[PDB]
Amino acid sequence: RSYQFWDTQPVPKLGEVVNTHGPVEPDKDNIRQEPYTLPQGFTWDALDLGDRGVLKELYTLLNENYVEDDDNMFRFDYSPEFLLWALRPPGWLPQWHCGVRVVSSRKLVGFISAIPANIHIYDTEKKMVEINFLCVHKKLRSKRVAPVLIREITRRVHLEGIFQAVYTAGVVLPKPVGTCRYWHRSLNPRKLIEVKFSHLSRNMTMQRTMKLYRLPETPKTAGLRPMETKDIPVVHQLLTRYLKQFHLTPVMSQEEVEHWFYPQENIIDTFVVENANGEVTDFLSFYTLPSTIMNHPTHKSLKAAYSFYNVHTQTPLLDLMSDALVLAKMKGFDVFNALDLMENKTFLEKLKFGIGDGNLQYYLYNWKCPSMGAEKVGLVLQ
Numbered sequence: 001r002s003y004q005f006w007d008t009q010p011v012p013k014l015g016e017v018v019n020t021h022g023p024v025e026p027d028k029d030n031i032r033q034e035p036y037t038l039p040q041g042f043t044w045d046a047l048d049l050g051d052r053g054v055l056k057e058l059y060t061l062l063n064e065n066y067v068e069d070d071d072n073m074f075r076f077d078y079s080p081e082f083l084l085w086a087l088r089p090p091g092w093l094p095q096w097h098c099g100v101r102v103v104s105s106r107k108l109v110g111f112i113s114a115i116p117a118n119i120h121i122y123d124t125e126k127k128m129v130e131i132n133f134l135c136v137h138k139k140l141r142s143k144r145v146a147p148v149l150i151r152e153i154t155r156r157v158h159l160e161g162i163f164q165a166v167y168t169a170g171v172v173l174p175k176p177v178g179t180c181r182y183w184h185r186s187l188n189p190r191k192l193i194e195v196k197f198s199h200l201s202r203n204m205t206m207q208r209t210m211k212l213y214r215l216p217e218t219p220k221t222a223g224l225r226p227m228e229t230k231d232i233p234v235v236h237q238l239l240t241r242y243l244k245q246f247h248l249t250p251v252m253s254q255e256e257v258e259h260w261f262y263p264q265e266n267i268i269d270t271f272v273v274e275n276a277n278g279e280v281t282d283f284l285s286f287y288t289l290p291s292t293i294m295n296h297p298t299h300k301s302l303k304a305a306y307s308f309y310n311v312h313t314q315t316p317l318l319d320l321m322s323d324a325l326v327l328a329k330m331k332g333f334d335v336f337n338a339l340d341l342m343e344n345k346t347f348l349e350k351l352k353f354g355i356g357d358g359n360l361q362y363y364l365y366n367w368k369c370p371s372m373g374a375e376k377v378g379l380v381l382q
């Protein structure tokens with residue numbers, strides 16, 4: 001209906017059709033110097049994630065209070081080392097790791113983050129931030145703390161001369177530039193049925209289901225191997241060229257490519273295809289993000305892989321993703337998740353992905369442009 005907070009923000013209204021390209025409002029020439037006021041008993045604290053104790057406090061906040069499915073059965077369980085990967089890419093700033101603490105106990109009860117990103121949106125490239133990890137402790141919910149967090153990070157980003165942002169959320173807000181759907185590929189169908197993520201259908205037995213989802217023990221694509229340091233430039237080249245075909249994409253430097261793709265166990269996997277000539281022609285990537293399974297006596301966690309960026313020039317995408325599934329299965333993953341963005345719709349149903357509940361909406365702050373189909377979205381966030 002109406003949005004008490006979002007109606008005040010430089011975003012387009014829901015329902016309106018946009019036929020133009022540009023900022024909702026001009027760059028601000030002076031910026032509020034003072035932090036926005038929090039409710040009594042709470043205080044701002046920029047979190048030094050290089051401090052092990054502090055990073056663990058953030059881990060705990062998110063582990064207990066971050067995104068849950070609509071049925072409150074699963075919650076994201078970002079690891080401390082994943083958080084460090086996600087939150088300290090090239091150009092990261094300490095003031096952009098924005099925490100809220102209880103004054104008396106010092107308990108961490110809120111967080112929001114910004115990281116810098118160059119973003120290509122239709123015919124324009126803009127320096128932006130990506131906003132992520134917005135979280136308010138369950139005990140502080142529905143107390144309008146989130147608008148304060150959003151305004152405060154906005155202010156801190158403005159101070160650095162940045163006036164646009166990109167973000168995703170499961171909720172519908174003014175106004176999505178793209179709407180995506182999560183799809184899931186069962187790797188361990190037994191466990192997934194046991195924990196009620198998926199259901200054993202009427203026309204299939206467990207024996208049939210396990211047979212349906214059974215995968216080869218090793219990948220089939222010739223010359224597929226983990227990305228190494230020597231592959232950083234070619235991965236950068238391949239990615240840059242591949243992304244041109246989409247309408248919302250990152251523009252990554254070679255240093256950013258090293259950060260986002262160089263393999264780190266239990267965080268990010270990247271495999272390249274090195275052909276018979278020694279040329280790298282393709283790559284696949286996926287990140288590691290487990291979920292907590294709540295209120296279960298025996299199964300406490302679900303290990304999930306998330307499709308990241310997959311670039312093909314000589315190996316068909318279908319083959320690359322088949323190998324991604326096999327590699328994920330080998331590494332002990334229970335499920336493989338992918339969005340319906342980029343060219344993913346060409347392989348999702350073929351490789352036995354099932355559609356998930358809920359949407360992932362893509363948003364831009366202070367940028368008005370026509371909305372795009374999922375197939376034109378070429379940006380994947382953590």
Ligand SMILES: CCCCCCCCCCCCCC(=O)SCCNC(=O)CCNC(=O)[C@@H](O)C(C)(C)COP(=O)(O)OP(=O)(O)OC[C@H]1O[C@@H](n2cnc3c(N)ncnc32)[C@H](O)[C@@H]1OP(=O)(O)O
Binds near residue numbers: 136
């Ligand atoms: C130039 C720089 C710009 C930088 C900033 C760019 C914008 C970035 C924007 C943020 C990008 C975040 C990206 C991610 O991290 S998406 C992940 C979000 N996190 C979670 O879902 C974790 C679990 N949930 C919580 O912690 C929450 O309940 C939160 C913190 C989400 C809301 O806390 P609470 O439940 O206690 O509610 P409130 O009473 O305080 O406040 C209610 C208001 O908040 C609006 N709301 C609710 N959910 C979201 C949401 N996910 N994005 C934007 N707005 C949201 C809601 O419509 C209402 O406004 P309005 O309806 O009255 O208008």
Ligand SMILES: COc1cc([C@H]2SCC(=O)N2Cc2ccccc2)c(Br)cc1O
Binds near residue numbers: 070074076291304356
């Ligand atoms: C349960 O329905 C889904 C929930 C999620 C998110 S919400 C909290 C969480 O932990 N998830 C990761 C997960 C949990 C379980 C299976 C696969 C992925 C996603 Br993304 C897509 C779904 O369809």
